[PDB]
Amino acid sequence: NMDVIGERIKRIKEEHNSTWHYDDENPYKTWAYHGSYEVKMINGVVKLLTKPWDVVPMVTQMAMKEKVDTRTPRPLPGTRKVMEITAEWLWRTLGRNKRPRLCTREEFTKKVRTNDSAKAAVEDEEFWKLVDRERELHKLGKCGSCVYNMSRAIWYMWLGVRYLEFEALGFLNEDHWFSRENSYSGVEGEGLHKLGYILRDISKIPGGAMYADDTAGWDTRITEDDLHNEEKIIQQMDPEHRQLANAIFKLTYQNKVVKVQTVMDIISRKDQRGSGQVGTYGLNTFTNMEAQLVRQMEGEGVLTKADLENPHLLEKKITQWLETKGVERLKRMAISGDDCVVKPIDDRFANALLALNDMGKVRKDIPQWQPSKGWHDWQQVPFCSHHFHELIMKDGRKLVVPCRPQDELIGRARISQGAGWSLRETACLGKAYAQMWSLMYFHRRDLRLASNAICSAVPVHWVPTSRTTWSIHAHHQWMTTEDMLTVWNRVWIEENPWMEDKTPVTTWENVPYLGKREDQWCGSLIGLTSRATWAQNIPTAIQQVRSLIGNEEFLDYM
Numbered sequence: 001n002m003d004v005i006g007e008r009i010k011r012i013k014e015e016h017n018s019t020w021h022y023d024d025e026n027p028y029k030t031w032a033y034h035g036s037y038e039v040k041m042i043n044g045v046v047k048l049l050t051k052p053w054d055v056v057p058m059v060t061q062m063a064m065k066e067k068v069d070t071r072t073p074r075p076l077p078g079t080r081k082v083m084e085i086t087a088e089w090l091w092r093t094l095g096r097n098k099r100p101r102l103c104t105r106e107e108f109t110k111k112v113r114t115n116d117s118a119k120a121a122v123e124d125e126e127f128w129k130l131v132d133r134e135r136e137l138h139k140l141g142k143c144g145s146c147v148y149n150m151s152r153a154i155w156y157m158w159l160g161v162r163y164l165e166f167e168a169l170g171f172l173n174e175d176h177w178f179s180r181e182n183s184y185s186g187v188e189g190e191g192l193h194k195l196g197y198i199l200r201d202i203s204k205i206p207g208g209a210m211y212a213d214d215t216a217g218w219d220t221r222i223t224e225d226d227l228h229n230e231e232k233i234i235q236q237m238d239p240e241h242r243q244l245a246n247a248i249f250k251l252t253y254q255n256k257v258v259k260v261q262t263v264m265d266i267i268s269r270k271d272q273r274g275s276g277q278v279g280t281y282g283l284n285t286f287t288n289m290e291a292q293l294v295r296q297m298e299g300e301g302v303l304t305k306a307d308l309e310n311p312h313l314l315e316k317k318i319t320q321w322l323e324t325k326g327v328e329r330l331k332r333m334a335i336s337g338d339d340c341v342v343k344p345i346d347d348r349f350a351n352a353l354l355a356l357n358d359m360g361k362v363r364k365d366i367p368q369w370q371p372s373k374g375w376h377d378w379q380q381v382p383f384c385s386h387h388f389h390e391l392i393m394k395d396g397r398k399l400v401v402p403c404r405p406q407d408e409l410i411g412r413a414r415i416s417q418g419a420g421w422s423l424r425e426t427a428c429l430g431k432a433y434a435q436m437w438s439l440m441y442f443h444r445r446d447l448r449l450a451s452n453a454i455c456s457a458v459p460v461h462w463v464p465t466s467r468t469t470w471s472i473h474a475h476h477q478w479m480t481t482e483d484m485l486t487v488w489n490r491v492w493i494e495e496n497p498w499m500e501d502k503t504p505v506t507t508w509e510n511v512p513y514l515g516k517r518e519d520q521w522c523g524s525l526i527g528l529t530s531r532a533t534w535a536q537n538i539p540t541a542i543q544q545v546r547s548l549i550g551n552e553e554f555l556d557y558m
């Protein structure tokens with residue numbers, strides 16, 4: 001407990017003797033509580049061009065820690081042994097070609113410069129002076145200011161913890177440890193437009209149905225034994241790397257210290273996965289790959305109830321399975337953090353639930369012991385909030401495209417993140433959404449129409465700025481004034497490894513749509529008269545946005 005978190009606790013209070021106090025009205029039942037202190041937007045351009053959706057309930061809803069405060073029961077001793085054998089094998093596999101290394105002040109600085117007031121911090125030497133100071137503590141096995149959150153220079157300590165963590169564990173991302181070529185199951189770096197193609201290739205593998213069980217609150221199901229297993233990566237590091245990462249793991253993951261927001265409460269605990277942390281996506285991916293391997297082993301009858309209970313379980317048959325089949329079983333999977341698709345060798349997997357529940361990874365909204373439902377059509381599998389469609393172009397070439405319910409797309413575009421922003425900033429975010437729809441959702445009739453209308457309305461030379469999304473699967477090819485059909489050709493033809501025939505597409509009329517039925521099943525208002533009204537009267541509202549923006553130069557895109 002206190003030897004490891006105390007310095008961090010003693011600090012923040014001593015700073016906040018202004019308003020520091022205990023409370024017996026704190027609602028913390030499984031996190032340790034230490035104390036507290038007092039401390040205390042619609043996009044008009046897109047809205048006007050999406051009138052029929054003013055109505056729509058999901059659109060109205062988007063414009064407008066009960067599950068975190070639990071304990072996860074400790075996995076059985078056989079489970080713990082299997083997790084351990086499998087983690088060591090996975091890490092050795094992931095490191096077969098790459099070596100871990102430290103990341104640098106320069107790498108991190110160049111990252112900040114191309115992604116929120118931190119830029120001001122990374123051009124101050126005194127920021128790096130505090131990093132150096134905290135790093136020296138870390139090397140001694142201590143920690144002075146690395147705390148998690150759920151113009152006061154408070155912000156330097158926080159950004160400094162993130163650099164320190166990036167320095168010690170960023171190589172998992174920076175060097176693509178979970179790319180599909182290195183990890184087999186991973187998809188990091190692929191981007192949304194490739195995930196569908198990956199699922200289709202998984203469908204070609206012989207075996208059972210395709211399963212996509214999502215976990216109830218994955219980050220809260222990360223156990224002390226999972227953290228122990230994630231940490232075995234340090235055995236592959238150079239001694240000076242090993243020191244700093246051991247520091248991150250022991251003192252920032254296996255022992256966190258948090259603030260929640262009128263009062264701010266500061267709180268600690270020894271398991272679960274922290275909110276922000278740079279290592280969160282890679283370590284979730286790693287542990288999901290492990291858990292699904294273990295579930296496949298159970299599926300194949302390699303692991304039984306008695307094995308999970310057994311404190312003296314023999315390694316040899318786990319090792320053998322892993323050594324002779326592990327890589328093949330990884331190739332049946334697409335795993336991105338807590339998102340997984342698994343195509344097991346048969347459907348016994350659907351009822352292989354002993355090890356999955358015992359490791360804590362309890363599926364959401366299903367009784368613990370009901371068999372999983374798998375899909376026999378890869379186009380029905382959900383993954384990373386999407387499903388994916390095979391489309392036949394007029395020239396007979398096939399695209400695989402991402403799709404999700406249309407009101408979610410329109411409802412996100414209709415929201416401006418932040419107040420005070422000027423019409424030009426609001427027009428430019430709309431263009432970013434409009435052009436993202438051009439690149440990824442061009443196959444949705446209404447979104448290609450709305451996209452054209454928004455781009456008809458904002459100056460053709462204005463550059464879209466600020467992100468449409470934080471997803472790790474987004475490459476933001478739409479943040480540009482390059483012609484969108486040229487980007488479209490680059491993304492879907494030129495750089496498309498699943499597109500053999502490189503013949504460019506010269507017109508949007510040869511960019512296909514979903515079939516009409518499927519378009520309507522996935523939310524289209526096509527066929528509704530109010531949609532046909534909107535479509536007829538769209539040049540009017542375009543003109544109205546032009547006349548408020550001013551006498552800039554516009555292009556028509558209808």
Ligand SMILES: COc1ccc(CC(=O)O)cc1-c1cccs1
Nearest residue numbers: 192384385468469470471473474
């Ligand atoms: C997996 O890709 C996503 C998942 C979720 C979301 C919604 C959101 O996070 O804002 C967007 C995306 C992407 C849109 C465009 C390229 S990725």
Ligand SMILES: [Zn+2]
Nearest residue numbers: 143144145146
């Ligand atoms: Zn620290």
Ligand SMILES: [Zn+2]
Nearest residue numbers: 389403404522
């Ligand atoms: Zn769809």
